[PDB]
Design a protein around this motif. Structure first.
Motif, PDB file in Angstrom:
ATOM      1  N   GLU A 157       0.792  -1.227   0.000  1.00  0.00           N
ATOM      2  CA  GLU A 157       0.000   0.000   0.000  1.00  0.00           C
ATOM      3  C   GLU A 157       0.825   1.279   0.000  1.00  0.00           C
ATOM      4  N   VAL A 158       1.938   1.234   0.713  1.00  0.00           N
ATOM      5  CA  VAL A 158       2.810   2.388   0.843  1.00  0.00           C
ATOM      6  C   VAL A 158       3.456   2.655  -0.501  1.00  0.00           C
TER       7      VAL A 158
ATOM      8  N   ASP B  63       9.481   6.445  -2.351  1.00  0.00           N
ATOM      9  CA  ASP B  63      10.238   7.453  -3.095  1.00  0.00           C
ATOM     10  C   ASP B  63      11.033   6.716  -4.172  1.00  0.00           C
ATOM     11  N   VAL B  64      11.110   7.277  -5.362  1.00  0.00           N
ATOM     12  CA  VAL B  64      11.789   6.572  -6.424  1.00  0.00           C
ATOM     13  C   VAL B  64      12.881   7.475  -6.977  1.00  0.00           C
ATOM     14  N   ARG B  65      14.089   6.946  -7.051  1.00  0.00           N
ATOM     15  CA  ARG B  65      15.192   7.665  -7.662  1.00  0.00           C
ATOM     16  C   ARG B  65      15.693   6.924  -8.912  1.00  0.00           C
TER      17      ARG B  65
ATOM     18  N   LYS C 298       3.634  -1.630   4.814  1.00  0.00           N
ATOM     19  CA  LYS C 298       2.693  -2.549   5.439  1.00  0.00           C
ATOM     20  C   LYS C 298       3.289  -3.932   5.709  1.00  0.00           C
TER      21      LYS C 298
ATOM     22  N   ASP D 231       5.469   3.770 -15.621  1.00  0.00           N
ATOM     23  CA  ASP D 231       4.385   4.579 -16.142  1.00  0.00           C
ATOM     24  C   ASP D 231       3.040   4.094 -15.628  1.00  0.00           C
TER      25      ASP D 231
ATOM     26  N   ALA E 130       2.996   4.806 -11.704  1.00  0.00           N
ATOM     27  CA  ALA E 130       2.845   6.210 -11.297  1.00  0.00           C
ATOM     28  C   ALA E 130       1.484   6.794 -11.691  1.00  0.00           C
TER      29      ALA E 130
ATOM     30  N   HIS F 289      -1.052   5.324  -9.184  1.00  0.00           N
ATOM     31  CA  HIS F 289      -0.642   5.797  -7.861  1.00  0.00           C
ATOM     32  C   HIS F 289      -0.622   7.312  -7.602  1.00  0.00           C
ATOM     33  N   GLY F 290      -1.344   8.076  -8.421  1.00  0.00           N
ATOM     34  CA  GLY F 290      -1.298   9.531  -8.387  1.00  0.00           C
ATOM     35  C   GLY F 290      -1.958  10.272  -7.228  1.00  0.00           C
ATOM     36  N   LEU F 291      -2.221  11.562  -7.446  1.00  0.00           N
ATOM     37  CA  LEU F 291      -2.735  12.500  -6.430  1.00  0.00           C
ATOM     38  C   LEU F 291      -4.268  12.490  -6.195  1.00  0.00           C
ATOM     39  N   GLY F 292      -4.686  12.941  -5.014  1.00  0.00           N
ATOM     40  CA  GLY F 292      -6.098  13.127  -4.714  1.00  0.00           C
ATOM     41  C   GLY F 292      -6.471  14.591  -4.502  1.00  0.00           C
TER      42      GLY F 292
END
Lengths: 107, 108
Positions: A14-15, A18-20, A40, A98, A101, A104-107
């Protein structure tokens, strides 16, 4: 469509990490680094984690370079590194990222 | 060509950055941070950089948060941060990043 990351197969984490993303100076290789803050799977998974599985419509991408971080006996984080040594691996990985992300985007 | 990054509008930067992508835990915002190791715009070093322009078939994405980065007292590098405050901004940025990363890939 569906793209997920799993520490134990069959269980979606779920978590969001950070991706580099890095690329070698000569363009010969690349690296994706993932850092998970209190995932989790550490919250008593309870099964031992042996790898990270990037799962989408094409199948899996797999890395074994995966390490839990401990403070006073408690796993508090997970770091994972995925190294790409060919054009095909880089292209396969970007396709996954792709799909990931975007779902997994914004709300 | 699909997608490029520019420090001066109309000039594509050759150096590929290290990129870090974060998402706030509550899903309210996101951030992309860019590190360029000695980018051509610094080596040739004429025009002043006022922004970073992410350019693809849909248009540009822009950030003004761009800084010279010093190593041993020398402005040899650039850092940039692009902050996303909405779902629209995130989805649009991921579209750019796909195109950029796909056209900036590996050789042999």
């Amino acid at each position: 469509a569906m793209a997920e990351i799993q520490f134990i197969r069959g269980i979606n984490e779920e978590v969001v990490p950070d991706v580099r993303l890095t690329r070698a100076r000569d363009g010969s290789s690349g690296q994706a680094m993932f850092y998970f803050d209190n995932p989790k799977i550490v919250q008593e998974g309870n099964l031992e984690v042996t790898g990270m599985y990037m799962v989408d419509e094409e199948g899996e991408i797999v890395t074994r370079d995966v390490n839990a971080k401990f403070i006073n006996g408690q796993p508090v984080a997970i770091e994972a590194t995925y190294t790409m040594r060919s054009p095909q691996e880089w292209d396969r990985f970007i396709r996954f990222m792709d799909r990931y992300a975007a779902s997994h985007g914004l709300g």
